[PDB]
Design a protein around this ligand. Structure first.
Ligand SMILES: CC(=O)O[C@H]1C(=O)[C@@]2(C)[C@H]([C@H](OC(=O)c3ccccc3)[C@]3(O)C[C@H](OC(=O)[C@H](O)[C@@H](NC(=O)c4ccccc4)c4ccccc4)C(C)=C1C3(C)C)[C@]1(OC(C)=O)CO[C@@H]1C[C@@H]2O
Ligand SMILES: Nc1nc2c(ncn2[C@@H]2O[C@H](COP(=O)(O)OP(=O)(O)OP(=O)(O)O)[C@@H](O)[C@H]2O)c(=O)[nH]1
Ligand SMILES: Nc1ncnc2c1ncn2[C@@H]1O[C@H](COP(=O)(O)OP(=O)(O)NP(=O)(O)O)[C@@H](O)[C@H]1O
Ligand SMILES: Nc1nc2c(ncn2[C@@H]2O[C@H](COP(=O)(O)OP(=O)(O)O)[C@@H](O)[C@H]2O)c(=O)[nH]1
Ligand SMILES: [Mg+2]
Ligand SMILES: [Mg+2]
Lengths: 324, 412, 426
């Protein structure tokens, strides 16, 4: 029994917003985020409470600013530790187009702005390499895919122009048939794959989803008999397309799955995204949602919609057990 | 001086062919005479084709008949965004090509059917693109909003909560004629359980003739289009008055025809004669534009109305002393040669804003939720360039239309 | 607009002959002849199903897919059989084995490319394509397997155009085959995930409806087929006619599918009276809704009375009052509020053409999306397990290059499909 962790993050104004002289309608204090409706200024502002509240509207010179490193060391390290404990984990970024989902998950591979995914990978390998018990050995395999109009593309295998089939293994759940799963032995190798994968994405409103998966295997060697008990945790880091057809089936279905789970049949199979993430939503997985928010008055409805779906997500609870 | 018209959606086109018929009929311009002054839009060819195959075939220019051979789709999204988009330019072009040719116009009488694909969506952006290209004019859209219980499309509300929110901030005055509440009139005030769509059309085709046609026509008390919106909307919300006609008597059955003013005017406020299932269940009128036509003595009116102003059970808003725009025309109505309309020598096409629609909107909004509450046919729009935004954010929209139509009344 | 029929398998094929037998007459197209059309309206929209070459030869734009020569060689050697351009015949002289696996992975998989080839020659015909009609039976090889593939490919080539599927789901009481649930469960699987409108017909729901609603004592197949083909004509072709309120595949689709599964319907025709006597003409309209909405008269096996509806589409086609139509529908929606689901204020989708079925005065096709069809996939799904458990005639599948996880997959999928559908019955 573990509830879905939910964080909200508000970014700086973008060019569109500055050009319309947008005012900031988002306020944050502690774990409370309040949104002002520019349309009805005298109506009571709506407040929401979340596990994490990242005020990233200003800049690093600000004392209360939430940087990439701070967002990661917070929710990121939390989930990585769960993976070390043997739990499957998932972190997905959700929000309006341009709200800051990719910046939070991937960031920029330059000076100081790496997002959750690169940092977690670096942290994962750093920890593995600091192991001092020779009875422990590890394996790290990675997969990276894109879901566009219900079709799946293998980002680590651009040579291939066929969309992979999402299937249901009779006993082990959903999987992408013939999706590349590469073993990596260093942060540098996994980062090259990440960079290669990011470049083959399409290709400026995204309407594809990106799923970066890591299969982290921990092998404990028992000295006396020679059996090696395995510990496997799947780490799924998701960067969703923004919210505003076959192009939007996945996002709408996710909304319904999230609402249904919060309400407690579920249309998991109604879309490739919810099908593949079935166990992370209501299964054996420690899951977190990072809701990206625009700070601008002009996006009140979209932002309010995001806050509401993030509020429901908070109510989801999943039965978790360590994979030993 | 003039007023272009854009009949959008099969319906808006059927009604169009009708209103367009009544016209020449009372202007002595047979099949092939002058030249219309409107356009026809639809994403289903076969319907506009009916104007290309059937009657009033050569009275139009294949230029004011826009079609998108593609697909209609009983869904807003597709018609507004995705498909409907492709045509709009072209559409506009005519309402910019037809808007130029004229001489100091006044606006565009738009004809659409709220709960459709080409009618809800498309227009949404048509009126949308107008409010910007000619903000300096009148945008009176004549709608046929969702039958209170006898709707057709399964989604209807999705399509009508969406045409309202997108057009709201663009129309001047939106006239409303309820498809079902018109049937009643065909059952109760004309007697016929055989009402073909071709009839309801003859009816609006009448009430409408009283708006533009005759009004833009000289008389003893002329009323310009602007006049309406001015004397008819108390507030910027593209406020929607209701259309009503008086001598809706049968040209066969009963015959008391000679029903002096004093009668035909009282016959407007009885709820069973208003082309809208918005029975004045409480809705306080806040402005009525009594358009009369035919042989009418101004005193007869400035008396028949006086009697009304003091019936009280007809309670008018507070903040409104007098809300009675008396429009008098000369030429009596003009009934189809042999349809089923009586044919009197005077009529009253009274339209008005009534706190009543507080209902009609309510009952139509609720609908929406029920389905949205389960996303029902949502995947049909999303996959058509829309989002959880446009729905949820157009719901909130009307919400303040339920409060608006509530505040502007019920309170003093 | 347009569409391109697809005669997968023998059944789907046999029916092709009946669907085209009809439709043609409902469009005045003699064997190879042209448009003798009693009227002039049965031509302005034909395109939807034909092509212009000669000037008297409007050839049906369908596909005839089958791994058993004799079949197509019975359809091509009989009546209207000589109207299809030979190019249409995509045969597979191989052994059309009754195995879903033999017509979907091993034998059919070859003949596929030589099909898609044509399905493209026909799609790229002209004007604008709407979707494809698909006929077949989910109880055989060339039907469930190979036809279920034809679509999985079609839906990758034009995820835009629609896909109506006319499936002859395995009748209950008696199965005209043995592995039936195998060939079935496996094809429904493919359906729930490609086509977006399926009209399930039951050879025994027909008999009944054909032996008691038509005192018909010797209901040959030709008949059943004929009755079915009667409904699929009311659906498509029909709406491609004028009407006070007309719709078209999409409207039908965009008003009938609340949730993406694709959902399957159950078609019902209107005037279904025995020849001589019965010719009661009680067809004012309340008589048609009386008909259409009763239990019996639903080409499906299950009975509506056994589960709410999500959507309904009375696609009428004969001059009537948009009042006596729009009205009736209502009382109907209130007399049976019980079963009609509530979260949809107006389940019913009234549609109204003008011209009726050639020789009739007034008809109305019914396309119901009721939750009742839950109690059918249940059936099928049951039969599977009861026999899967023992891997009954499984060697005929695996031995054809199949998987023990493939069968698992389908059942589950289609089995879950049962689940969901209940999520609304409640
Ligand atoms: C003298 C007269 O009025 O005869 C009628 C007749 O007696 C009845 C009984 C017809 C007759 O139909 C059947 O007996 C029947 C046989 C097998 C399967 C199904 C039905 C009829 O054969 C069928 C025929 O239907 C049509 O003409 C429609 O256009 C129909 N056509 C075909 O099905 C068709 C048949 C053969 C060759 C080509 C087409 C149609 C319906 C929907 C969509 C498209 C076309 C009609 C009115 C009659 C006869 C001739 C006796 C009925 O059926 C239809 C589909 O109309 C059966 O109940 C109705 C009521 C009709 O009154
Ligand atoms: N009064 C009147 N109402 C009509 C007429 N035709 C349709 N309607 C009504 O308008 C609505 C139907 O809209 P549709 O015909 O489905 O669609 P459309 O608005 O033409 O556009 P599409 O959905 O893209 O086809 C229903 O509520 C009908 O009751 C008509 O001729 N007269
Ligand atoms: N915390 C932040 N600090 C600085 N810049 C940010 C921050 N968050 C987002 N941005 C920038 O704002 C834009 C939103 O970026 P991303 O590109 O992150 O959006 P999404 O990923 O929100 N967009 P979309 O994929 O189209 O649906 C980019 O230009 C980012 O670099
Ligand atoms: N209605 C109907 N059903 C048929 C016809 N032919 C076969 N069927 C049904 O189809 C099933 C058998 O599949 P079949 O068509 O022989 O498969 P295939 O030929 O190998 O693709 C049985 O349930 C039959 O009742 C037909 O002409 N009409
Ligand atoms: Mg992004
Ligand atoms: Mg239309």
């Amino acid at each position: 029994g573990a509830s879905v962790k939910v964080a909200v993050r508000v970014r700086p104004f973008n060019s569109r917003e500055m050009s319309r002289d947008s005012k900031c309608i988002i306020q944050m204090s502690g774990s409370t985020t309040t949104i002002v409706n520019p349309k009805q200024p005298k109506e009571t502002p709506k407040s929401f409470s979340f596990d994490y509240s990242y005020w990233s509207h200003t800049s690093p010179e600000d004392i209360n600013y939430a940087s990439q490193k701070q967002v990661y060391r917070d929710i990121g390290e939390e989930m990585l530790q769960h993976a070390f404990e043997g739990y499957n984990v998932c972190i997905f970024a959700y929000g309006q187009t341009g709200a800051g989902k990719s910046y939070t998950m991937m960031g920029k591979q330059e000076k100081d702005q790496q997002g959750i995914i690169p940092q977690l990978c670096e942290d994962l390998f750093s920890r593995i390499n600091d192991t001092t018990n020779d009875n422990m050995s590890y394996s790290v395999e990675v997969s990276y895919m894109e879901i566009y109009c219900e079709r799946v593309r293998d980002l680590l295998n651009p040579k291939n122009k066929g969309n992979l089939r999402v299937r249901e293994h009779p006993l082990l759940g959903p999987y992408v048939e013939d999706l590349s799963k590469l073993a990596v032995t260093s942060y540098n190798d996994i980062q090259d794959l990440m960079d290669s994968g990011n470049k083959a994405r399409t290709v400026t409103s995204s309407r594809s989803h990106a799923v970066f998966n890591i299969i982290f295997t921990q092998k404990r060697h028992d000295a006396e008999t020679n059996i090696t008990t395995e510990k496997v945790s799947k780490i799924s880091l998701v960067d969703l397309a923004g919210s505003e057809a076959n192009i939007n089936k996945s996002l709408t279905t996710l909304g319904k799955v999230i609402s249904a789970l919060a309400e407690m049949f579920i249309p998991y199979r109604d879309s490739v995204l919810t099908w593949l993430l079935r166990e992370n939503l209501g299964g054996n997985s420690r899951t977190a949602m990072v809701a990206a928010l625009s700070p601008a008055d002009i996006n009140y409805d979209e932002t309010l919609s995001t806050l509401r779906y993030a509020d429901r997500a908070k109510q989801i609870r999943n039965t978790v057990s360590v994979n030993l | 001086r003039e007023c272009i018209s854009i009949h959008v959606g099969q319906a808006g086109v059927q009604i169009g062919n009708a209103c367009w018929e009544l016209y020449c009929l009372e202007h002595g311009i047979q099949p092939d005479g002058h030249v219309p002054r409107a356009v026809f839009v639809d994403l289903e060819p076969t319907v506009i084709d009916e104007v290309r195959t059937g009657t009033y075939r050569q009275l139009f220019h294949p230029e004011q008949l826009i079609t998108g051979k593609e697909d209609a789709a009983n869904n807003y999204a597709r018609g507004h965004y995705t498909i409907g988009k492709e045509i709009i330019d072209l559409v506009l072009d005519r309402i910019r090509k037809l808007a130029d040719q004229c001489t100091g116009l006044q606006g565009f009488s738009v004809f659409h059917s709220f709960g459709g694909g080409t009618g809800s969506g498309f227009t949404s952006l048509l009126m949308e693109r107008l409010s910007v290209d000619y903000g300096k004019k009148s945008k009176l859209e004549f709608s046929i909003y969702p039958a209170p219980q006898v709707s057709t499309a399964v989604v209807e509300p999705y399509n009508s909560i969406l045409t309202t929110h997108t057009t709201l901030e663009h129309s001047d005055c939106a006239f409303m004629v309820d498809n079902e509440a018109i049937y009643d009139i065909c059952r109760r005030n004309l007697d016929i359980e055989r009402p073909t769509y071709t009839n309801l059309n003859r009816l609006i085709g009448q009430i409408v003739s009283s708006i533009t046609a005759s009004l833009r026509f000289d008389g003893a008390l002329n009323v310009d289009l602007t006049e309406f919106q001015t004397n008819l909307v108390p507030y910027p919300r593209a406020h929607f008055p209701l259309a009503t006609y008086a001598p809706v008597i049968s040209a066969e059955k009963a015959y008391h025809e000679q029903l002096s003013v004093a009668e035909i005017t009282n016959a407007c406020f009885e709820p069973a004669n208003q082309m809208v299932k918005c029975d004045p269940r409480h809705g306080k009128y806040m402005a009525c534009c009594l358009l009369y036509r035919g042989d009418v003595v101004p005193k007869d009116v400035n008396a028949a109305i006086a009697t009304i102003k003091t019936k009280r059970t007809i309670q008018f808003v507070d903040w409104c002393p007098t809300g009675f725009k008396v429009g008098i025309n000369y030429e009596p109505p003009t009934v189809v040669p042999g349809g089923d309309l009586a044919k009197v020598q005077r009529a009253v096409c009274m339209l008005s804003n009534t706190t009543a629609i507080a209902e009609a909107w309510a009952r139509l909004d609720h609908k929406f939720d029920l389905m949205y509450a389960k996303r029902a046919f949502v995947h049909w729009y999303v996959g058509e360039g829309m989002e959880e935004g446009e729905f949820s954010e157009a719901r909130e929209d009307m919400a303040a239309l339920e409060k608006d139509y509530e505040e502007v009344g019920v309170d003093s | 607009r347009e569409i391109v029929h697809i005669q997968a398998g023998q059944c789907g094929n046999q029916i092709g002959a009946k669907f085209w037998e009809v439709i043609s007459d409902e469009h005045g197209i003699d064997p190879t002849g042209s448009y003798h059309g009693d009227s002039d309206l049965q031509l302005e929209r034909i395109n939807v199903y034909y092509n212009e070459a000669a000037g008297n030869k409007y050839v049906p734009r369908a596909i005839l897919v089958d791994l058993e020569p004799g079949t197509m060689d019975s359809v091509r050697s009989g009546p209207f059989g000589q109207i299809f351009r030979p190019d249409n015949f995509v045969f597979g002289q191989s052994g059309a084995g009754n195995n879903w696996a033999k017509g979907h992975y091993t034998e059919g998989a070859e003949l596929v490319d030589s099909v898609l080839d044509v399905v493209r020659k026909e799609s790229e015909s002209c004007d604008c394509l709407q979707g494809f009609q698909l006929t077949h039976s989910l109880g055989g090889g060339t039907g469930s397997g190979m036809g279920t593939l034809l679509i999985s490919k079609i839906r990758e080539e034009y995820p835009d155009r629609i896909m109506n599927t006319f499936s002859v789901v395995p009748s209950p009481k008696v199965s005209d085959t043995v592995v039936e649930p195998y060939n079935a469960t496996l094809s429904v699987h493919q359906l729930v995930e490609n086509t977006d409108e399926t009209y399930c017909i039951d050879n025994e729901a027909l008999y009944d409806i054909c032996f008691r609603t038509l005192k018909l004592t010797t209901p040959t197949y030709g008949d059943l087929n004929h009755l079915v083909s009667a409904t699929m004509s009311g659906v498509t072709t029909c709406l491609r006619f004028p009407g006070q309120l007309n719709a078209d595949l999409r409207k039908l689709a965009v008003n009938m599918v609340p949730f993406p599964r694709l959902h399957f319907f159950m078609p019902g025709f209107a005037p279904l009276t025995s020849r001589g006597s019965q010719q009661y003409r009680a067809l004012t309209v309340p008589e048609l809704t009386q008909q259409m909405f009763d239990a019996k008269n639903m080409m499906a096996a299950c009975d509506p009375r056994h589960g709410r509806y999500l959507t309904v589409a009375a696609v009428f086609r004969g001059r009537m009052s948009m009042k006596e139509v729009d009205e009736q529908m209502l009382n109907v929606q209130n007399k049976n509020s019980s079963y009609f689901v509530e979260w949809i204020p107006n389940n019913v989708k009234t549609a109204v053409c003008d011209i009726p079925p050639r020789g009739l005065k007034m008809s109305a096709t019914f396309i119901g999306n009721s939750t009742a069809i839950q109690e059918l996939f249940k059936r099928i799904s049951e039969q599977f397990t009861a026999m899967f458990r023992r891997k009954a005639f499984l060697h005929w599948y695996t031995g054809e290059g199949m998987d023990e996880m493939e069968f698992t997959e389908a059942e589950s999928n289609m089995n879950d499909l049962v689940s969901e559908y209940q999520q609304y019955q409640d």
